[PDB]
Amino acid sequence: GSLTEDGLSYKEKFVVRSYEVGSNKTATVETIANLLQEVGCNHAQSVGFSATTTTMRKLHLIWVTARMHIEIYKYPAWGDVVEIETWCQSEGRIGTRRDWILKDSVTGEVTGRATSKWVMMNQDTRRLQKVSDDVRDEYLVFCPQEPRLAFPEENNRSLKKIPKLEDPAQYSMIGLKPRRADLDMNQHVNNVTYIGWVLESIPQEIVDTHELQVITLDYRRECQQDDVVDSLTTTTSNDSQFLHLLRLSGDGQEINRGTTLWRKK
Amino acid sequence: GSLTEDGLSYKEKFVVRSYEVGSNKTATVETIANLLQEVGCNHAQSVGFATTTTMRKLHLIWVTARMHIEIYKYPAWGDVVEIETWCQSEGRIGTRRDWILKDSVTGEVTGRATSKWVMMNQDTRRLQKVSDDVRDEYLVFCPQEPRLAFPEENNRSLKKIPKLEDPAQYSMIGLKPRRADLDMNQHVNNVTYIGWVLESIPQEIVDTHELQVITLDYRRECQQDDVVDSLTTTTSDSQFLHLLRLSGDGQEINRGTTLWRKK
Numbered sequence: 001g002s003l004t005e006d007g008l009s010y011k012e013k014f015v016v017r018s019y020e021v022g023s024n025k026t027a028t029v030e031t032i033a034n035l036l037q038e039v040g041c042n043h044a045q046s047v048g049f050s051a052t053t054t055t056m057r058k059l060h061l062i063w064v065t066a067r068m069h070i071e072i073y074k075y076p077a078w079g080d081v082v083e084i085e086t087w088c089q090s091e092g093r094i095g096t097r098r099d100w101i102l103k104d105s106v107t108g109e110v111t112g113r114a115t116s117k118w119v120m121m122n123q124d125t126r127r128l129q130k131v132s133d134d135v136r137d138e139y140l141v142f143c144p145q146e147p148r149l150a151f152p153e154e155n156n157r158s159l160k161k162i163p164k165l166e167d168p169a170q171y172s173m174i175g176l177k178p179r180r181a182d183l184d185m186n187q188h189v190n191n192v193t194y195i196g197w198v199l200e201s202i203p204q205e206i207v208d209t210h211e212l213q214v215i216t217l218d219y220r221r222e223c224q225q226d227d228v229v230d231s232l233t234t235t236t237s238n239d240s241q242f243l244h245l246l247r248l249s250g251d252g253q254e255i256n257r258g259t260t261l262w263r264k265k
Numbered sequence: 266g267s268l269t270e271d272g273l274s275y276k277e278k279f280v281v282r283s284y285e286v287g288s289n290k291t292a293t294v295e296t297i298a299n300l301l302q303e304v305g306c307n308h309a310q311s312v313g314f315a316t317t318t319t320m321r322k323l324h325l326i327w328v329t330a331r332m333h334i335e336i337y338k339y340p341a342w343g344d345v346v347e348i349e350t351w352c353q354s355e356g357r358i359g360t361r362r363d364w365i366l367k368d369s370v371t372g373e374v375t376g377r378a379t380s381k382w383v384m385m386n387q388d389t390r391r392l393q394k395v396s397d398d399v400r401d402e403y404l405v406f407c408p409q410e411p412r413l414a415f416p417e418e419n420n421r422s423l424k425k426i427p428k429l430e431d432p433a434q435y436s437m438i439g440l441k442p443r444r445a446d447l448d449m450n451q452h453v454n455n456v457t458y459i460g461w462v463l464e465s466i467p468q469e470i471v472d473t474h475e476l477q478v479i480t481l482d483y484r485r486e487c488q489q490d491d492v493v494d495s496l497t498t499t500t501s502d503s504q505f506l507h508l509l510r511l512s513g514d515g516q517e518i519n520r521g522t523t524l525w526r527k528k
């Protein structure tokens with residue numbers, strides 16, 4: 001729970017809780033996602049945000065997720081101490097980037113890593129806008145000046161166009177609804193719930209024999225508190241790959257589209 | 266994260282996480298419920314468990330029968346909350362687990378909980394009366410004198426809960442658990458039932474009142490592939506009667522009561 005020596009990144013340690021683990025006695029993908037969100041919120045708070053800046057609050061602007069990419073090598077067990085390091089970076093006028101590094105506190109080894117793309121949006125009109133110079137200045141003094149990427153790769157999985165799932169979907173999970181636990185302090189559906197909804201259409205047999213290694217997820221539209229989501233999946237592929245689609249049950253309005261990679265246990 | 270000086274209770278501190286808070290910027294009832302479960306699991310682990318040597322041999326496990334939680338002040342995001350838990354025996358009826366919620370800064374009691382646990386065979390799901398051999402290995406970790414978080418004889422935690430009669434005033438149907446709701450043994454987490462109970466409370470009541478008390482009976486377990494209907498009726502401060510039942514046959518899984526205060 002502290003900024004690093006240069007104040008250009010934040011570090012936090014977590015002990016994995018009993019209710020945070022799944023069938024394999026290891027932290028669920030949603031627990032990891034929540035832990036990334038927690039270390040990110042505290043980083044924004046430790047430098048004077050609320051993650052809006054002074055100019056963003058004046059112009060009724062907020063940061064919204066556009067893409068999420070998480071890769072796990074080892075899921076921490078119940079009781080294990082995991083340490084996460086996060087940092088923000090500017091992507092010119094497209095928006096901002098937030099990266100994460102997951103580590104084992106005992107061995108120091110990197111057991112996972114994440115990256116997210118954030119676009120600026122007017123709170124009310126919901127219209128995405130390009131980042132102005134005045135706002136870009138207010139967050140550049142908290143970002144590393146040299147590019148520091150959790151996924152440095154010359155042609156990585158985090159920056160690839162995701163196709164649209166064509167009907168009929170191989171697998172599906174219908175009538176998914178958020179509850180009050182899924183909503184945040186601003187009554188909006190938590191970004192992590194969409195990850196959990198995406199994986200609900202993965203069959204229970206794949207979950208019992210494989211471990212989720214990678215998950216890329218695009219956030220096309222928000223699901224309202226009183227909305228109902230349909231989760232769709234199709235095997236595309238020792239490794240399994242799937243195409244995903246979250247859409248509103250009625251009109252079929254797309255809210256999310258993603259991909260997952262799984263490996264044998 | 267340590268047993269107290271006498272080793273007859275466990276204490277643990279928690280910093281309230283950003284995703285654990287609701288609209289009012291304070292910890293949700295399910296976050297508190299999860300924090301009670303966490304401190305309870307660690308207490309069982311710190312003493313060698315929550316099944317025991319003879320319980321494993323007989324294919325026996327502890328199941329919740331009743332939950333009673335009272336909150337006076339919900340902790341804010343960033344606040345440090347300290348919980349103290351302890352186990353006690355209830356003859357051969359079962360076991361009891363109590364909790365005390367406190368503010369780490371002021372030391373004030375901001376909440377308290379109590380739960381009744383029944384002995385069940387994991388396979389046949391039959392309730393077994395607790396034997397003398399298992400009560401001996403459980404008594405060495407319990408206070409010998411009765412220590413009750415709700416000492417009031419015949420209070421809100423020990424009262425018969427009636428069955429909600431149709432038509433329910435409010436309802437929330439088609440509730441389903443996801444993988445996040447299942448525990449390491451693939452069973453639906455006890456806290457999900459609390460959240461499902463409160464889903465039938467209207468959004469207007471939540472926006473103007475705070476949940477002060479919640480008593481909840483656990484009649485039957487909801488399977489991974491099951492669908493629940495949540496029912497509520499105002500009986501009254503606001504009071505409600507609750508009923509969780511399976512969507513199809515209407516099989517009762519839970520019944521409870523909630524008390525709310527104006528903000």
Ligand SMILES: CCNC(=O)Nc1cc(C)on1
Pocket residue numbers: 033034036037040041044051068098116191192
């Ligand atoms: C400054 C706040 N940062 C975030 O909210 N980060 C995340 C991470 C995930 C996952 O969802 N939100």
Ligand SMILES: CCNC(=O)Nc1cc(C)on1
Pocket residue numbers: 298299301302305306309315332362380455456
């Ligand atoms: C020894 C394990 N104790 C519990 O599981 N306690 C709880 C508390 C709540 C709530 O649900 N389970």
